[PDB]
Amino acid sequence: IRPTIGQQMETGDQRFGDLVFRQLAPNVWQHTSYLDMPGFGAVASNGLIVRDGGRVLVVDTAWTDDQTAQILNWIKQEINLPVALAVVTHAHQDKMGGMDALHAAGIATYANALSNQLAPQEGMVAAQHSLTFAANGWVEPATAPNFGPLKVFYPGPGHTSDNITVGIDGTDIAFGGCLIKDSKAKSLGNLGDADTEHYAASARAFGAAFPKASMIVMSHSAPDSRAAITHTARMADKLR
Ligand SMILES: CC1(C)S[C@H]([C@H](NC(=O)COc2ccccc2)C(=O)O)N[C@H]1C(=O)O
Ligand SMILES: [Zn+2]
Numbered sequence: 257i258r259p260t261i262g263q264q265m266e267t268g269d270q271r272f273g274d275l276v277f278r279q280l281a282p283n284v285w286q287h288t289s290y291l292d293m294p295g296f297g298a299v300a301s302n303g304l305i306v307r308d309g310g311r312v313l314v315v316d317t318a319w320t321d322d323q324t325a326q327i328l329n330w331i332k333q334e335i336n337l338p339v340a341l342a343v344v345t346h347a348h349q350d351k352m353g354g355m356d357a358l359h360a361a362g363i364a365t366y367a368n369a370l371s372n373q374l375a376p377q378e379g380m381v382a383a384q385h386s387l388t389f390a391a392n393g394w395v396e397p398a399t400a401p402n403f404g405p406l407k408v409f410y411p412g413p414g415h416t417s418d419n420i421t422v423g424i425d426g427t428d429i430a431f432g433g434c435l436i437k438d439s440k441a442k443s444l445g446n447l448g449d450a451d452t453e454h455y456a457a458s459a460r461a462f463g464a465a466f467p468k469a470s471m472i473v474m475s476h477s478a479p480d481s482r483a484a485i486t487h488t489a490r491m492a493d494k495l496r
């Protein structure tokens with residue numbers, strides 16, 4: 257697997273069917289799935305798997321149901337603990353394309369209320385539960401029951417108006433999804449649904465929400481330093 261967009265395979269990557277898994281911490285793995293483009297090649301998308309004692313938590317689906325069912329099969333084989341819930345980080349196919357596989361498995365799914373409202377318009381199935389957010393971006397705790405180490409933060413509109421992010425408490429990892437691009441990126445990716453006015457502030461708000469996270473995970477590049485945040489914000493400064 258050699259994607260046109262997204263990180264390549266490296267030492268420490270485990271191939272499992274059509275997907276790639278990489279351990280990031282004792283209890284955190286990155287899942288990677290690929291959508292092949294007629295004429296362009298494969299585009300990688302990354303999410304996370306977190307072990308929290310006797311249960312597993314997932315951030316983001318794969319691009320498709322079948323790929324997402326493979327994530328669940330990898331969890332069964334390598335961890336052998338139940339998936340308690342999944343959080344999906346906005347209403348686009350790379351993050352929510354496999355909702356039906358989670359539902360078929362009986363996994364409780366959560367997304368920003370706005371993501372659930374946009375899902376029908378975006379060709380997605382809504383999560384079964386809605387997260388809501390305070391005026392400073394922090395999730396309302398009663399809407400995120402029993403989330404363990406997942407600390408959900410809405411940084412403001414950027415890549416989309418509904419994009420959310422997730423810090424992993426008890427680790428130095430934070431997940432920026434499609435909002436954050438890596439420190440070497442040349443572009444901000446698909447800006448078709450983006451808020452170019454507010455993007456820079458939203459990227460910086462993510463950094464300030466998780467100020468001690470040193471490993472920044474993102475949808476389409478390998479985990480990076482905090483320069484992913486600062487570089488994304490610098491590129492976004494140019495859009496205003
Ligand atoms: C990696 C991206 C540039 S595309 C992805 C997202 N597209 C889809 O999920 C489904 O459409 C397609 C998906 C892939 C290729 C073509 C169509 C979007 O529109 O934002 N997020 C972008 C990003 O992270 O910048
Ligand atoms: Zn998107």
Ligand SMILES: [Zn+2]
Pocket residue numbers: 350434475476
């Ligand atoms: Zn994306």
